[PDB]
Point group: D2
Chain length 323, copies 4
């Protein structure tokens, strides 16, 4: 008899289908930061990693596996084949390369049907850029209802904003509230009316808030949200830690059915004079069914016009794509 | 009056110093894995990063800072000057290259260590840079620290890997699979078969051939896999980072929280196993707010003692020729 | 339009089911400690509480709900009716007034006759974790009444005993209890068995270093450590009336392994028929692998002649009580 | 050679001061709920309990200690003597007993407790939970001689938490994402600041201008009324409140011990605000960190809201001027 059988008496061998499984597709800097953040937050009982570069993928899996003693996620698997992803509650897409969008669309033509085949009832969380467009692409390819296709969107943009606000005020970002909505990245919209500490509106105290003529230049806090991201790419070549942590925050709400509100990208047709199938960030209630509800933010005329212009721009791109 | 003043009435401006500061030196793959793991474990009120590559350092600092909303570490700083590391409780050294390998990290350490001791004379030093056992001795020699405050990550990771592999073979979580890999980090590490157990049941007693060539289940290969899988991971992804980062954060937890948990880390073993030279090797150590306060005297077979002694002679052979 | 509808646009109203639901039956000191520990470890997406005292039950429910801001368990419910417990992954029984032993058995069997079928009705596929005393007898009872397979009926058993043991060992050694290993097995409480051969720090056997360990000839009286496990328990009851915090922490650790499918090894009470010459349907603590199917495997500990005699004696007594129980 | 000496070689005996020590004074339901929550949040490296009931104190201590395997707080101590509390960063006071006697009786308790705490932990922060919390925070401040930054009253921290729970139930949103502030005097006279109530920075009052008035169709005023009715109801049903206060207190402790500078509604000396010029303590949003309350947020209040706080300050000072120290 084996040492195992001498030591251990087995009551049953039967294995359940995974109960709280997460898949991350793409094991680059973003994918792996999402993975480590998810693992240290105990969100999943099974983590699957998928990529096309097989050696890298295997090496990343093993490195995580070698840390198992320090974790509470007992099964970590990987493969090029999407059979390793079967029965995921949440599938996080971080893989990626008008040229660039279409190149990512082509990636998504392979990835998305494979995800759907093995986890037809999963929530999809899209991180790959440009995120708002590619969330739309994942929605179209998957055939999923809009509640189950979520884009990382402006979650990171808002986190950066709150970090910068906190620095200026001498307050932890958790107590510094403020929302950056619309299109992720360059064209995002800081909603000055919602910016507050303890329910005290900064805009009400300081009407120049968010205007060019502001003596304290509070507009620069949003400009530095965009300038931050370029600076990080310049200095280190890529962003990973902040995005990883932000994605894990979204995963927590979904896997634990928290119904917290996050600025994420959702299908926004029917609001703000937007009449096309575009995804943009608004505050959304996140839970076990993905996005169940959204907050209807009262926007100024200028805020509305910025969202509409993004919508037109995104749609101008999307209508040209071949699936 | 600014908006800040309009919003916030200041009671006092009495500026403070951190109570639980940790410094990571070197922001490569290992350093940043240590940092993120330490950050997600809430071990520090201030994290300081140091490196010689200025753009990389600034950019990694910023990247962590940008995830502040999701953390409970209110200040992350970085700098080339070791004034940013002042009054660190714990300083983790992960800088250096991944006979020549040793002398070059020694040269790095001649710059780093005096600078650390200058600004944080009461810190615990935790050495990760390879070869970790040698560089722990080097840090101890240069710092002048008492041996309790100079700790090498040593075989904490090797033992973690062993327990992972043991667990896969037995179908038990690594937490519940007990087994110690001691001595030199890397090729010459020693699996202590006599200590291997689940629920206090000795596997060697149940399976006398455990760890010998006669073993039909080839358990000896589990230790071989521990030695190898590091090479395997370097071949596949170019480096190791996550496992070491997790293991360093586990050590940091015991130090920062004064837990007095036992970990296999590299310490001065002169006086044990017939070893007379000032060499660092891994034995199980009690880790707390004063670093290594105590060590466990593992009872080793003659073969096991001979193996540690051989390592001590080898390491000393390299160390006697190093120039400080 | 209402304020809610002005503020919030609903995408869908599909009402789904909880994914990681835990029920605690009996909201006394033990049950509520279990509850707070489980809440603070983020093990559940829904917590249900059941008791027969309706006001106490509601107040406890409300008091936990009021701390929701500080937790990540979005739904806490309670009621006398078992419909609140539907679709639980794990149901923890801490019901029955605290404590002769046979009369304790008698009254807690009667309670179980009502509780267990209602639990099974609403959560046929749950794992049952029995804490109520005498825990070994009541684990048998839950298994008999429920009809569940052996893997899904777990008794808290010697989990607390072993934790107390490890605390005391750590105090004598100046080492954290996590790094002090040792197993108290067999019957929970007065008749538990400390397995001297397994006691170790860093794989170093204390018994090998110190052959008199656990014997009357031991000059350092290490046998008092196990005796103090027993004495500790009586002393806490004398001092504050009951045990709550330690048992609650110990139960949350078991829940952790089960909910997260960890396959960690814990000393818990399981059907031991087939080991140690025991041929009756008795539950006693051995080391068990715990995960999402409950107890999937158990460790076969080598016991001394004496240690084995004590388990065998316990098994004989327990079966003596159990064979006369009427179902 | 003992077994310990055979197993373990000692490098140094030099034990240090505990670095992250918390004391809880009073081991009733509140105190112990604070204790367990602090332990499960890994905020301290040493916890000390004090009470005047000696058997209960030892038993609670031992019961916590027996859970040590599942915690990361390596030293739990207790005693009637305040020497067990030495070098605490933070001392939480939950000890406490017509109803104007009640105040003087808790003052009498504080006359004994506070000087002992100060003697052994001169640099601590004081966190007062005992009721009536606003008066008793003033009392602790007065007896201790501490700067105002180091005497913190639990105040409306629990009130606000209940409010956010209730708001969250009404909207179907997690309380974390439901923002709203209950300020002023803890308990029956607290003030809900309707102007600040929001989800995602979207003011409820702007959407629904009648919010919190008697003309309000939906009577959101009920949420605040329910905040007070809830606390009476919990007492009526289980005899005391424990779990929610324990959790809210651990949250305050987390900000202080980790120097987070988060903003919490806690009781601080509000002299010089809202037309108040007496030495009284009322809840406003405060920044909490390693030196306690360093800063407060100047909430824009309506005249009605300022008037309510003024009346509270007047009533509180009325009682305080009659107290015997
Ligand atoms: N929405 C946000 O806020 C953030 C978005 N992103 C995006 O994340 C994406 C990736 O970022 P990095 O990790 O830095 O890139 P990376 O280039 O380092 O890694 C990308 C990975 O995608 C994999 N991949 C490519 N084709 C694939 C396929 N057909 N199936 C599976 N995997 C495939 C690659 O092999 C590679 O491992 C980019 O689109 C980037 O813009 C990055 C940061 C922030
Ligand atoms: N003890 C263990 O179990 C493990 C040990 N290690 C070791 O960790 C070390 C680093 O590994 P990686 O992070 O992968 O290397 P890396 O090349 O990615 O990063 C090393 C960093 O050290 C910095 N550095 C060099 N000289 C410096 C100086 N004088 N002052 C400050 N910073 C300086 C470099 O600029 C670089 O950023 C290597 O020695 C490697 O062997 C790696 C993994 C596991
Ligand atoms: N196995 C172990 O290591 C430990 C076991 N235990 C046991 O846990 C049990 C509970 O202890 P305490 O909380 O201190 O008792 P308790 O008297 O404080 O609470 C018991 C609760 O059960 C409720 N209850 C009674 N009948 C019920 C029914 N038919 N259905 C639902 N609930 C019912 C009571 O109303 C009460 O709320 C006891 O049996 C005690 O011995 C306690 C400590 C350690
Ligand atoms: N600010 C808030 O939101 C909350 C305020 N509180 C207050 O907490 C206090 C205690 O509440 P409970 O634990 O339920 O009452 P409790 O009566 O059960 O416990 C009070 C403890 O204080 C002890 N004590 C009395 N005098 C003492 C002294 N001189 N030194 C040390 N200990 C002493 C008692 O022995 C007792 O153990 C009360 O004032 C209560 O009103 C309670 C709930 C919420
Ligand atoms: O920070 C980011 O990094 C990337 C980026 C994209 C476009 C412009 C700047 C940066 C990037 C570029 C190259 C390689 C890796 C990367 O992650 C990708 C990306 O979406 C972000 S977030 C961001 C970007 C621009 C403005 C504001 C924000 Cl908050
Ligand atoms: O600590 C415990 O408390 C109780 C007990 C039972 C029998 C003998 C002593 C104590 C108890 C009695 C009355 C009221 C409430 C209680 O929890 C119940 C119980 O099982 C334990 S654990 C225990 C008991 C005896 C020896 C060793 C151990 Cl580890
Ligand atoms: O909830 C509480 O409980 C107590 C209370 C005091 C006065 C009126 C109701 C309750 C209480 C009474 C008796 C015994 C123990 C107790 O904890 C003490 C107390 O301050 C609270 S909190 C509270 C109280 C009243 C209104 C709004 C709030 Cl948020």
């Amino acid at each position: 008899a084996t040492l195992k059988d001498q030591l251990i008496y087995n009551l049953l061998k039967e294995e359940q289908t995974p109960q709280n499984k997460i898949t991350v597709v793409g094991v680059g800097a973003v994918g792996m930061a999402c993975a480590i953040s998810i693992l240290m937050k105990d969100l999943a009982d099974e983590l699957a990693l998928v990529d096309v570069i097989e050696d890298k993928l295997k090496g990343e899996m093993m490195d995580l596996q070698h840390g198992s003693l320090f974790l509470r996620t007992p099964k970590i698997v990987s493969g090029k084949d999407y059979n390793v992803t079967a029965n995921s509650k949440l599938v996080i897409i971080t893989a990626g390369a008008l040229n660039l969008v279409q190149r990512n669309v082509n990636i998504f033509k392979f990835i998305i049907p494979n995800v759907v085949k093995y986890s037809p009832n999963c929530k999809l969380l899209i991180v790959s850029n440009p995120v708002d467009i590619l969330t739309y692409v994942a929605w179209k390819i998957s055939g999923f209802p809009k509640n189950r296709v979520i884009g990382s969107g402006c979650n990171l943009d808002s986190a950066r904003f709150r970090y910068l606000m906190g620095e200026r005020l001498g307050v932890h970002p958790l107590s510094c509230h403020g929302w950056v909505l619309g299109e992720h990245g360059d064209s995002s919209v800081p909603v000055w009316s919602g910016m507050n500490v303890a329910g005290v509106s900064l805009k009400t105290l300081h009407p120049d808030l968010g205007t060019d003529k502001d003596k304290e230049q509070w507009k620069e806090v949003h400009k530095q949200v965009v300038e931050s991201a370029y600076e990080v790419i310049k200095l280190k070549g890529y962003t990973s830690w902040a995005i990883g942590l932000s994605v894990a925050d979204l995963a927590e709400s979904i896997m634990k059915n928290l119904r917290r509100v996050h600025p994420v990208s959702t299908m926004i047709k029917g609001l703000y004079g937007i009449k096309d199938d575009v995804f943009l960030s608004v505050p959304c209630i996140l839970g076990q069914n993905g996005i169940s509800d959204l907050v209807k933010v009262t926007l100024t005329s200028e805020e509305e016009a910025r969202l509409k212009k993004s919508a037109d721009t995104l749609w101008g791109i999307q209508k040209e794509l071949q699936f």
